[PDB]
Every structure is written in C-alpha cells, then in structure tokens.
Design a protein around this ligand. Structure first.
Ligand SMILES: N[C@@H](Cc1cc(I)c(Oc2ccc(O)c(I)c2)c(I)c1)C(=O)O
Length: 249
C-alpha cells in the first residue's frame, strides 16, 4: 500500500491484485451489456438524411430507448457493490446515471468518416438528426464529447470504469447510504487511475483530463433532465415508452 509516497517519489502505481479483480468484473459487466460489442461499425443502419421537435426522428429514438436503458440496469446488476446497496439507493443511482452512461456509450461510437454516433449499436445518426429529434443542444454536447474522446483512445475497461464512477455518485438527492457509495467510488477511481498508469497513454496529464469528462457527462445528464421537460410540453405523453418515463420522471 502507501499511495501518497510512491506518487511522491514519481512512481506510477499499477493495479494491486485485488484491483485487477475489480477491473475484470467491471470490464466484463460492460462488455456483456454493450450492444453489438466490437462488431458495431458494420452492424449499423444509417438513418435516412430525410429524417431530419421533428416527430418521426423522436419516434425512431424512442423505439430503441427502452433496450438501451435496460442494458444500463444490467451493467449495474453485474457489479457486486451495487447489489450490496438498498433498493431505494439503487433506483436512485440508476435514475441519476442513466443518461450519463448512455451518452458515454454513444459518444465513444463517434465515427469521423461519416460524422455519426451510433445508438444501441444499430442506428447511426448525425448531429442534426439527434438534435431535431428532441435532444437539442444535448446532441451538440454528446458529439463534441465523442470527437474529443477519440484521441483518448479508450478501451473497454476505461469506458467501463468511467461508467462505474458515474453509477456510484454519492451526491444524488435522497440517498441513504452516502458514505458507502463514496467508498465504492473511491475504490473505482483508484483502480481506474492505476489502470491508466499501466496503460501508459501518450497524452500529457491524461488522468485529470479524463476526470473533466466525468463532469461533462454529468452536465449532459442534468441538461437532458431539462430537455425532457421541454419534450413533455412539445411531444405527447403516448409517444414515450414507460421505462423512459419512470427513469426520467
Ligand atoms: N447508444 C447508447 C444508448 C443511447 C440510446 C439512445 I435512443 C440515445 O439517444 C437518446 C437518449 C435520450 C433521449 O431523450 C433521446 I430523444 C435520445 C443515446 I444519446 C444513447 C448505448 O449504446 O447504450
């Protein structure tokens, strides 16, 4: 052990044995629940230029959102720390992280040849389409993120660990087990940092840079809560799948 003194000497600690297990678990959790795995660039339908609040865009995205929400719940269920928490807390962390995690899984499928992200592994959209379909400027935040993340060269473990950091956010309103959720967080952040030392990215100050993405995903979430209200007034209610409603209010 002895984190602060290794650092202080200039050494970059790689993962302890217990951390490599934590990493194997989050990584498999993510890889299991990540639609179409590594086979996504070919298994993807480009949404027609003409689907262009544009109601038919909205309708295509709401048709696929229910599975995408459920693959996040699945991600969480495969983290034993999440199972150690009370039911109210779990629901509370899911509702909090759900847009954050979906946004991240979209951003990391950004493709610069086509300027598209891919939703659910299956539907590639432009900025325009995602924006006009209900996301507004949340779409711009998501593409700008994905563009940026593409020099971070993240792998499945780094995305998985980001998801675990967002999932274990102890500042959500109403939580009962705050300090336990922070302990699990710190345990993820510590594994994640150690994992990045091992990765030896060729980017100056990679860690703090990656932490700044956590904040941007949080902003994308908060900002999506607001878009969702603007949608309750524009689009119906009958246009909204029931899992969508329950997660977002
Ligand atoms: N692509 C992700 C899942 C993912 C699915 C969908 I539909 C997305 O679009 C949204 C989300 C919220 C909204 O209110 C609207 I309107 C559209 C995003 I951004 C992400 C995955 O692989 O899990």
């Amino acid at each position: 052990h002895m984190e602060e003194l290794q650092k202080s000497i200039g050494h970059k600690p790689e993962p302890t044995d217990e951390e490599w297990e934590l990493i194997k678990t989050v990584t498999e959790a993510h890889v299991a629940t990540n639609a179409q795995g590594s086979h996504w660039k070919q298994k993807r339908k480009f949404l027609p230029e003409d689907i262009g609040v544009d109601l038919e865009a909205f309708s295509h995205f709401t048709k696929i959102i229910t599975p995408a929400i459920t693959r996040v719940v699945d991600f969480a269920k495969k983290l034993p720390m999440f199972c150690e928490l009370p039911c109210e807390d779990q629901i509370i962390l899911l509702k909090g992280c759900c847009m954050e995690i979906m946004s991240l899984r979209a951003a990391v499928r950004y493709d610069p040849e086509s300027e598209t992200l891919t939703l659910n592994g299956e539907m590639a959209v432009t900025r325009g389409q995602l924006k006009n379909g209900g996301l507004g400027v949340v779409s711009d935040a998501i593409f700008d993120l994905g563009m940026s993340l593409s020099s971070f060269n993240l792998d499945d473990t780094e995305v998985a660990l980001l998801q675990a950091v967002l999932l274990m956010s102890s500042d959500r309103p109403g939580l009962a087990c705050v300090e336990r959720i922070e302990k699990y967080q710190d345990s993820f952040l510590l594994a994640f940092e150690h994992y990045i030392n091992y990765r030896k990215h060729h980017v100056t100050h990679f860690w703090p840079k990656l932490l700044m993405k956590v904040t941007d995903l949080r902003m994308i979430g908060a900002c999506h809560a607001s878009r969702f209200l603007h949608m309750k007034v524009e689009c119906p209610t009958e246009l909204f799948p029931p899992l969508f409603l329950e997660v977002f209010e």
